[PDB]
Amino acid sequence: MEAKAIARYVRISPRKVRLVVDLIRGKSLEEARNILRYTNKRGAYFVAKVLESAAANAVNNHDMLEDRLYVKAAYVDEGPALKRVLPRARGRADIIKKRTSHITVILGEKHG
Amino acid sequence: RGEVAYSGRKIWPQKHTGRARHGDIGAPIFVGGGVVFGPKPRDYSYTLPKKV
C-alpha cells in the first residue's frame, strides 16, 4: 500500500528543491524528518510539508502504520513559470522566469 | 497585403538591428499579414456550345 501527497505551484525553482528531495528518496520517514530539519535550504521547508502530509494520508486514509513508513518515491516537476521583466542598461529589458515546482512524495511500508 | 488593415510603416530599420529586414506587417511573410494568391471573387460560368 502507498500514500501520496503533491504540493502543486510552489514558487521555488525545480532544480533547487530537487537537491533537497534527493536527500530523502528511499529514506525512512524518521530519518527524512531529521534530515529535512537540519538541511540548510529553503526547499527543506516545502519538502517537509509534502512529506508530513503524505504521512498523514497514510495513517488516516490508507490504513498504514507510521512506524513503518518510508519514502518510496519523490520527484519535482516544473509548473508554469511566472515571467517577470528585469530592466537592464541602455533601455534593454530582460525577462526573468520565476519558476514553479510540483512536489510529489510517495510513501510505502517497510515490513519486518 | 494591400487590403489588410495594418499600417504601411517600416517596422524597424533596414540595417543594424540584428533582426531580419522587413517592411510593413501586412506582408504575407507575417502571421496576420495578407495572403498571396488566395481566392478572389470570380465567375465559373462559360458558354458551352448550344449544339453540344
Binding site: 541602455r90 533601455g91 534593454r92 | 543594424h16 538591428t17 540584428g18
Partner: peptide, 16 residues
C-alpha cells in the same frame, strides 16, 4: 612599417 590601413577604427554597437 607603415603600410595601408584596411579597416576603420572600430567602435562597439548596441544590440536590443
Amino acid at each position: 612599417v607603415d603600410k595601408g590601413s584596411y579597416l576603420p577604427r572600430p567602435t562597439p554597437p548596441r544590440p536590443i
